[PDB]
């Protein structure tokens, strides 16, 4: 068991906690840092609009939240310099606040006694970025100390893109992610730096930018400069689909595109990328642990133009990818 | 034409602007104070998730927003002491920020050159509170200088309660308002001082407290101590219903309860309170200008226990009540 | 293993099937009658927009569906007279079509081999109506052969109405249930016998009738003529609350109303009626197995007027209550 | 006044009626055929969950509804053969039931007295298909008697596909339309021939087919075999976007793609196709009368791969396009 700390007990932080509880044999969360009182934090952990009730008992005091008898230390230092991770023998910190995506700032956790930091988001100045299943073999336990698990969408797109580029080659592609609304958006029309994300999220199709397609290049260098895209935020609370349209020099049919995915979606990689011929709708992939669920029923081909669609639970699927990455780091040298 | 200023260009502020444009012959909005840039403010005025597009042309510069050729001065003073309302000959300021519901603080607008302040909310230390149609005859143009238009729900409940208490007498009543979600609520589960309003608004029935039933006593003193209630926030963006269950010493039937409303819902009062026998659903009362739309089809009676239900557009219906109050003030002595 | 058949494999039928898999050791569903083809039936069983995926493999053919290796015989007979329940030795049929709530028609399942019929709905002409935890002890295994499990709302209302009446006496009460939309409402403005339920369900507060407060008299005769109410259908897919306002002759406080429910909400009754002081919203009671979750935080008192509020998963909570009734039935004599 | 009758008084029929009241001086609806009773018809006309209240008094009887003092004859004949359109001198029938998109069946309205039938949908065996603004000039008043106004998606796609093909040449293109749910989808998980549209519409992203990108070839023959796509149905009640990704042989930038649409989007064509640089979300195009609102802010270019996005109100925008086609028809000879 390697001991884990979470900085930021938001949606991603709480997902990660639950995912460890549900899915991990070799990690334990033993401390959390967040800016709120333990009554509030413990209530949000216990009850969730998306995931339902935590199955375990939750209690709290002024120092901690106890979950199924296991005491979780809770801190509220807004600067990670004031933390002491070594005091709880935390080796890995999950950096999920959203305000330390800069590795030069996330480094504070290591100064505060951790050995590894995993940023649950696109990062800057990081040692490395991983999409589990795609480039995790390149993790270097001595030199990759502050890393990034990339974005939900990148974790959906990159597995699919790896397989198709490997098999047919992708010249250029443009992505539309049709995505659940997220907490950056407004409930009612109100000021926002993005004048579209300003608009009432649960009654609008809301177009917004995302770096997730360009970010594929970080984990698949062969696709640098060849992918871009954007997001349409729509009224579901979780569950998203990545629609990629690309040009290939290969001569391709619907059936050969699908066969390539089916043939790759197997073994350990198939825990990242799944192949489905089912009549899927978003609610079917809620709490699905794959990073990418390829929908063979949606594949289209016109000439050398290809459209493929992969599903993802932008919360849970992403979190399970991050958990896979965390298990890898925890399985290798920690100093 | 009496010239009006709005402090706070949120949902209520923008509703009020539109209501003046659509419905008023004797008021004009000539200045606005708000903490945002004019590109953002002008975009939110022009496009609305609830009301649709403003029919008029909107332009802006760094000093103003011009609406159908009429230049609206815009300020961004966070303290109303720094404002100068007299410079634009504004007589009435609508105080719609939410952070000057204290009349001792709203008074600043009068020091800044206005003559009257109307708080678009339950207030404290106010000269008087009005529900138009219920107690507006008691407005005293010399001594009522900082006033309150009360809450959306109170504007729905008080008209109905006046008629029923007048005709049958109400001993005690308890209200449930089944209410559209509002901007105080969270889109995704997140910290909030109210741990229920913390929960994703568009997928939950969310119980929360409201003073609106006790506040009836401010405008109908005869009901002090006899009304209380709460709110169930539900997933519609606007449109609400007030369900009041009360005990009466009178012997009453469904048909006599309804006849009393029908008989009162007439003339000017009938612009506040309507009587309907239609098969209404919330979307039918969106942009309805009444404060209260009594639904005769929902009236129930068991013994001396009575249940009545009135609809309201918590945005537009409320705003039209506030506009009626503003026209009254504007029609009398301004000093 | 008491063998169960389901007539009508819609929301309630599929909930019942799942609840049997999840919560019963004594019951097994061996046969289903429904109007649809088996490809459709099996897809709707495998995948559920509310309950998520069934955690068991599903296959189908012209005659059956196989769930986790167990063959369920499937028929599609519009008329129950043309069924042979004896052919697979089913003893209890759950009648969940919606269209045979008249016991005079549902009786047809007994003629076709069943020993018992449980109507998943308010019924007419039935031997008996039950809210488990309230009056199930009056179940008569000789004379109660076609029975009603009453409605979702009744299964929420009756348990707290029993406790509070018994403690304080209810003079009259009026109820509003703020209720998830149901399958009979229209997605877009379209024809319906109820001109309000005609109206786009996911964007409207939709008022509609419910017999629930009057049907409580069937199970608590002491409350006959003392209750009425209506529903507001709102845009959530499941999860509901019943808001009851009543006047009493007793002297009551918030603390005293709430203490009455807490005392009673224990033991086996406590699996029907829960007592909560949690900050609940509707998603928190989705897939809750209680018929009634009393929300102590919502209790109000004004003179002699009392308001109380209880939650229910109108799908799963109701289904769990119905399973509790089915287990009771199946634990006694199944003659004939 | 050219007299119009409507067969099928559903979403599209009621939109058409309203659009005639709102935007036409030349057309008048004098008769309606629909399967429902007049109390229901008149209620659904008066009150609309999307469009709000009709601003006119509505009354009804056994034979008619009266809207702002004008009597509309109402029939309910399942079979168009039993209608007499001549009886009220209607010249154009809008065929909006959904079930007579085969011109071989819709022809029955001409036998029953109509001079022209306009099918509010993709059709089979029709004289002609039109997207107003794209190919309406080819309308032949002698030989085009039963015609299609094509689909909502086609009326969004074809206008920008015309402009960009003409300017740059489209090699192939694939489309996704992110589309408001429609009335055929199910509110709760329930049977449907499309097992995805079976699934609770207001809580799901629901993939489904559309002929729209292949139906563009009917109106722009130059694009035959070059377009395909599908729909994602999402939880908004109306408002949709068409996302088209195509590869071209030309050298194109974002600025150049966008400039091509701006140039073309003027005059009468500009009432079909708008050019926007606004920060649009779907509520902003609700009740917009254009068939296609090009969103310049969404244009992307990657090498020779181009993505463009246009909005449409799949109810009102489509209806306005159809009204534009009906006015055209009604401005020429109505013989026979
Ligand atoms: N769909 C998804 O949700 C998704 C998918 C992929 C990636 N991600 C990434 O995951 C990260 C987390 O996103 P989220 O959805 O979880 O957002 P969130 O719900 O707002 O979580 C962020 C949390 O950080 C806490 N926080 C902020 N500053 C802090 C500080 N100085 N010290 C301690 N705690 C602090 C906040 O606590 P308070 O609320 O008390 O301020 C908040 O609860 C982001 O970087 C996001 O881009 C999200
Ligand atoms: N259903 C309803 O909406 C409803 C019904 C009845 C009564 N009311 C009452 O109406 C009032 C307004 O509510 P709302 O729904 O309009 O909320 P809102 O949308 O948040 O509007 C409030 C606005 O005030 C602005 N503001 C805050 N502090 C300011 C300052 N110091 N100077 C200038 N502007 C400032 C904010 O601008 P920024 O956003 O840029 O910070 C915000 O846009 C509240 O008191 C509420 O209780 C609302
Ligand atoms: N919240 C709730 O859903 C709720 C709560 C409490 C009680 N109930 C009660 O439970 C009953 C079922 O409701 P529900 O929500 O499950 O509705 P539903 O989803 O429509 O279920 C009805 C099912 O019966 C089938 N069916 C109808 N007529 C049939 C016939 N003649 N032969 C065979 N199968 C037939 C239908 O097949 P098709 O789908 O092919 O038509 C459908 O699968 C109703 O009486 C309702 O009051 C419902
Ligand atoms: N977004 C859109 O809605 C959209 C956009 C573009 C094109 N369209 C097309 O427009 C057509 C109509 O669609 P819609 O959305 O308006 O569907 P809808 O709401 O179901 O309209 C169909 C109407 O036709 C009536 N009807 C059906 N069969 C009939 C018959 N034999 N005789 C008389 N009346 C009959 C129905 O009456 P009942 O209600 O009693 O069944 C209903 O009012 C479809 O072909 C569709 O593809 C729709």
mmCIF file of C-alpha atoms in Angstrom, chain C residues 12 27 32 79 92 104 116 120 125 161 180 190 225 232 242 315:
data_model
loop_
_atom_site.group_PDB
_atom_site.id
_atom_site.type_symbol
_atom_site.label_atom_id
_atom_site.label_comp_id
_atom_site.label_asym_id
_atom_site.label_seq_id
_atom_site.Cartn_x
_atom_site.Cartn_y
_atom_site.Cartn_z
ATOM 1 C CA UNK C 12 -42.176 -1.229 -12.767
ATOM 2 C CA UNK C 27 -38.195 -15.608 -5.241
ATOM 3 C CA UNK C 32 -42.630 -12.665 -18.473
ATOM 4 C CA UNK C 79 -55.281 -11.131 -23.288
ATOM 5 C CA UNK C 92 -47.418 -15.359 -8.086
ATOM 6 C CA UNK C 104 -62.388 -8.544 -12.360
ATOM 7 C CA UNK C 116 -51.939 -15.093 -6.557
ATOM 8 C CA UNK C 120 -48.603 -2.883 -8.955
ATOM 9 C CA UNK C 125 -62.676 -4.722 -6.929
ATOM 10 C CA UNK C 161 -49.759 9.292 8.386
ATOM 11 C CA UNK C 180 -40.755 12.902 -11.014
ATOM 12 C CA UNK C 190 -49.076 16.228 -27.701
ATOM 13 C CA UNK C 225 -62.654 11.354 4.361
ATOM 14 C CA UNK C 232 -46.893 18.489 -9.198
ATOM 15 C CA UNK C 242 -44.895 14.086 -0.389
ATOM 16 C CA UNK C 315 -39.641 3.589 -8.944
#
